[PDB]
């Protein structure tokens, strides 16, 4: 179906800097890409839906922007509550996932 490539596969960054994760689809998917956060031992939690809108209750430091084939997830500040694996998703397909690290 629609293949996805999510990069970087593993990222290590110190507090304060920005984290930019990129998902590349296999074709035009309009804006129907979602970004989820999964802490270890917990279910994924949706942060970005439709690639730009922010789920209610999410801090504003999480943001997403993209279209067509290319999408980007931006976390402006790596606050200590945020260490988790981040996944992109189009339809049934889930990204390979990236784990931030301190």
């Amino acid at each position: 179906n629609i293949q996805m490539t999510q990069s970087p596969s593993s990222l290590s960054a110190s507090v304060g800097d920005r984290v930019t994760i990129t998902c590349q689809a296999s074709q035009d998917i309009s804006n129907y890409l979602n970004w989820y956060q999964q802490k270890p031992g917990k279910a994924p939690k949706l942060l970005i839906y439709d690639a730009s809108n922010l789920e209610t209750g999410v801090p504003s430091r999480f943001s997403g922007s993209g279209s067509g084939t290319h999408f980007t997830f931006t976390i402006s500040r790596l606050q200590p509550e945020d260490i988790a694996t981040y996944y992109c998703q189009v339809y049934e397909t889930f990204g390979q996932g990236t784990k931030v690290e301190i």
Partner: protein, 444 residues
């Protein structure tokens, strides 16, 4: 130099939602599930004005006319069922045996001869009656039977005089509103339509309740039309509109009786009772060649979206209720559920008749309401039926491990897509007659 000038009657509109009244010719009868309490007489002169130099954005997937039709049809079903016999004294133990009459091997176990005690016109007297019930209407009380809805819902007999035959209904806008029709013949129901007209009412739309197949609908003018809210999303149904229809021949061969049982002071229960002659399975025939050329056209149009070299597979429904796992419909007054496993069973590589067995049911929850069911009375005689398959509702299989092949299965259940196939070309707009523009004229 220039001054504000006010114009009234300006031809400007906006997108809006409103309540649309229904026009209908309503000839005949001297007893219609719809045009008796809600709609009004038709228009002798259906006037359509072509709006030249007008390109208008349409969206069949955010059309409020579809939602209005859904609510209207549900409410009209409820209103038609309100003044009829409540069948609450029929939730009793039923002693059932198999039918001793000559029964074909396919129909063995489908029908049960059930004896039970019933109320009479006098409340202090009881009657021993017997009736024929389909096996799909009858649940064993333990591992003595009972109707299927007795645990969950109360049951109301449908009035036999009221007929379930769809009649066309035209959806008309009130004053200050207009209905824009997209006249483009290649339109997939979303985006700009260059050829637009305005109409007083929609075309005659038969409220046909069916699953997996659009019966007695409109036909595409040029080619088979594939429409989907998101063709890449497998969770979204694919509406297929044919350019040439496929005739479907349905029948229940059983010569059936209608026994009247006086259950109350003026209330009657209409049971099946007996069958004159042999007993055979109800079924629907379609032409094998016609179905073949229609499926070839559907594959040709699906490959536009899913690639030219991909293999298009037609498989039967994955699961669900009997309404969605089968072509469920109603013509002749009885409710058919036909196994379409023979319709959808093919693999199309990029390079006689079919008989569908049908099971009848008398206890129906049409719109899955809570605490409400309907008993469909039996029809006297042999019911036959001829319809035009004019489209399909499909669902693509997700999570495909093989990227070369795509699998499409029948779908349905949500009838908002049944009339999205009819209301795709219409759009309600709201006239803004007041405009302001610069002119050289100045008030004294």
């Amino acid at each position: 130099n220039l001054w504000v000038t006010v114009y009234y009657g300006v031809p400007v509109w906006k997108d809006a939602e409103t309540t649309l009244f229904c026009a209908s010719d309503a000839k005949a009868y001297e007893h219609n599930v719809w045009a008796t309490h809600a709609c009004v007489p038709t228009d002798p002169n259906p006037q359509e004005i072509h709006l030249e130099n007008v390109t208008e954005e349409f969206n069949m997937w955010k059309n409020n006319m579809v939602e209005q039709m859904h609510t209207d049809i549900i409410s009209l079903w409820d209103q038609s069922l309100k003044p009829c016999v409540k069948l609450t004294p029929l939730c009793v133990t039923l002693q059932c045996t198999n039918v001793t009459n000559n029964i074909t091997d396919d129909m063995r176990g489908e029908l049960k001869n059930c004896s039970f005690n019933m109320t009479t016109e006098l409340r202090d007297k009881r009657q021993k009656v017997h009736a024929l019930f389909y096996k799909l209407d009858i649940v064993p009380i333990n591992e003595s039977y009972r109707l299927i809805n007795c645990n969950t819902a109360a049951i109301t007999q449908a009035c036999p005089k009221v007929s379930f035959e769809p009649i066309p209904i035209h959806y008309c806008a009130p004053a200050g509103f207009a209905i824009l029709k997209c006249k483009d013949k290649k339109f997939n129901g979303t985006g700009p339509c260059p050829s637009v007209s305005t109409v007083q009412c929609t075309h005659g739309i038969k409220p046909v309740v069916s699953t997996q197949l659009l019966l007695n609908g409109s036909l595409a003018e040029e080619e088979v039309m594939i429409r989907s809210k998101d063709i890449r999303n497998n969770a979204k149904n694919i509406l297929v509109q044919f350019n040439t229809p496929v005739q479907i021949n349905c029948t229940r061969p059983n010569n059936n009786t209608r026994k009247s049982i006086r259950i109350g002071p003026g209330q009657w229960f209409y049971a099946t009772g007996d069958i004159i002659g042999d007993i055979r399975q109800a079924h629907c025939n379609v032409s094998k060649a016609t179905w073949n050329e229609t499926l070839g056209k559907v594959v040709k149009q699906l490959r536009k979206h899913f690639g030219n070299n991909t293999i298009i597979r037609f498989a039967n429904s994955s699961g669900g209720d009997l309404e969605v796992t089968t072509h469920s419909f109603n013509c002749g007054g009885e409710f058919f559920y036909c196994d379409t496993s023979g319709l959808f069973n093919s693999t199309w590589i990029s390079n006689d008749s079919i008989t569908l067995p049908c099971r009848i049911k008398q206890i129906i929850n049409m719109w899955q309401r809570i605490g409400q069911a309907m008993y469909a009375p039996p029809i006297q005689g042999v019911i036959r039926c001829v319809s035009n398959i004019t489209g399909l509702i499909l669902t693509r299989d997700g999570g495909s491990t093989d990227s070369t092949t795509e699998t499409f299965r029948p779908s349905g259940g949500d009838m908002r897509d049944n009339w999205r196939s009819e209301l795709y070309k219409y759009k309600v707009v709201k006239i803004e007659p007041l405009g302001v523009a610069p002119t050289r004229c100045k008030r004294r």
